[PDB]
Design a protein around this ligand. Structure first.
Ligand SMILES: CCCOc1ccc(S(=O)(=O)N2CCN(C)CC2)cc1-c1nc(CC)c(CC)c(=O)[nH]1
Ligand SMILES: [Mg+2]
Ligand SMILES: [Zn+2]
Length: 286
C-alpha cells in the first residue's frame, strides 16, 4: 500500500513529456513508479479512463497488481517487457494511426492484453497452453477486489472485451502467429485486406499483438543490443547470437512489419528500425 499511495497521489505528465509516442522509446532510464505513470498515461490518452469510467485508484491498483505478477528474477520475460509491449501498442495506435481503425472496446482490450500477455512467465527454460495461463492470470487480476478496471462496462461490453483480450493473449503464441500469418500476407498481397470483415479484424488484432510483442527487434541499435542481451541471458544463462538474430528477423519479423506498414504507412518506423538492426547483426555475423 506504500507504493499505491505514491502512485495514486502522483501527477501524470503528458504523453509528449513521457516519450511514449515514439517508436524508439526505451525504459532503461525509468523507475518502476515511472513505468506505472506511463501506463496510466496510455489509458488516459487512448480515452479509456473517460469512456469506461475507470476510477483512478482502481486503475492504479490494477497496474500495480499486473506489475507485481511478473517475476523480476526473469531476465527478459518480466514487467519491463510487458510495459514495452504496451508502449509499442500505444505508439502504433497514436503515431502509427491504427487507433482510428479500431473500436474503443478493441483498443481497451489490446492495451490490457499487451500488459498482461506474459503474466507470471517463469522464463523460456522453465516449462498455446502457456498463453492460457497468462490470460488466466489476467482474468484473476481483473476480478480482484479493488482492481476491477472493467466495472464500468455493461455486461455485453464486458464479454466482448474478455473475448478480444483472450484471443489477443493467445495470439502471442509464436506458433499461432506462424500458423495464421499466411492468410494475412496473402490478403495484403492481393490488396484484398479489409478491416470491415470480422474474421480479418480479429486476424489483424492477432498480428498487431505479435508486432508489439517483438517490438524490441525494431529499437535503435544500442537499445536492441541491450535487450538482445537480456533475451540471451534468459535463453542460455537461466558468437552464434548475431546469426540467430538475423534468422529470427528474416523468419519472423520482417514480413510482419512489412504487412503492418501496408496497413498503415505510419508504422514504417518499426519496419525501418527492424531493417537497420538486421544490418547490424548481419555485420557482426562475420
Ligand atoms: C538474443 C538471443 C537469442 O535470440 C533468438 C534466437 C532464436 C530465435 S528463433 O529461431 O526465431 N526461435 C527460437 C525458439 N523459439 C521457439 C523462439 C523462436 C529467436 C530469438 C529472439 N527471440 C525474441 C523473442 C523472445 C527476441 C525479442 C524480440 C529476440 O530479440 N530474439
Ligand atoms: Mg509469451
Ligand atoms: Zn511477450
Amino acid at each position: 500500500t506504500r507504493e499505491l499511495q505514491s502512485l495514486a497521489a502522483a501527477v501524470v505528465p503528458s504523453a509528449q513529456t513521457l516519450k511514449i509516442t515514439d517508436f524508439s522509446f526505451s525504459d532503461f532510464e525509468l523507475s518502476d513508479l515511472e513505468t506505472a505513470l506511463c501506463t496510466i498515461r496510455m489509458f488516459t490518452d487512448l480515452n479509456l479512463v473517460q469512456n469506461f469510467q475507470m476510477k483512478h485508484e482502481v486503475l492504479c491498483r490494477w497496474i500495480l497488481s499486473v506489475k507485481k505478477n511478473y517475476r523480476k528474477n526473469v531476465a527478459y520475460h518480466n514487467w519491463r517487457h510487458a510495459f514495452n509491449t504496451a508502449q509499442c501498442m500505444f505508439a502504433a495506435l497514436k503515431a502509427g494511426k491504427i487507433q482510428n481503425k479500431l473500436t474503443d472496446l478493441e483498443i481497451l482490450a489490446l492495451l490490457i492484453a499487451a500488459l498482461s500477455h506474459d503474466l507470471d512467465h517463469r522464463g523460456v527454460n522453465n516449462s498455446s497452453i502457456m498463453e492460457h495461463h497468462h490470460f488466466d492470470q489476467c482474468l484473476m487480476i481483473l476480478n480482484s477486489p479493488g482492481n476491477q478496471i472493467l466495472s464500468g462496462l455493461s455486461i455485453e461490453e464486458y464479454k466482448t472485451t474478455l473475448k478480444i483480450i483472450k484471443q489477443a493473449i493467445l495470439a502471442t503464441d509464436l506458433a499461432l502467429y506462424i500458423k495464421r500469418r499466411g492468410e494475412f500476407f496473402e490478403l495484403i498481397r492481393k490488396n484484398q485486406f479489409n478491416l470491415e470483415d470480422p474474421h480479418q479484424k480479429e486476424l489483424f488484432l492477432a498480428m498487431l499483438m505479435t508486432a508489439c510483442d517483438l517490438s524490441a527487434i525494431t529499437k535503435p541499435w544500442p537499445i536492441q543490443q541491450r535487450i538482445a542481451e537480456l533475451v540471451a541471458t534468459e535463453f542460455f544463462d537461466q558468437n552464434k547470437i548475431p546469426s540467430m538474430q538475423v534468422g529470427f528477423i528474416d523468419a519472423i519479423c520482417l514480413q510482419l512489419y512489412e504487412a503492418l506498414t501496408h496497413v498503415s504507412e505510419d508504422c514504417f518506423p518499426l519496419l525501418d528500425g527492424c531493417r537497420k538492426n538486421r544490418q547490424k547483426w548481419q555485420a557482426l555475423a562475420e
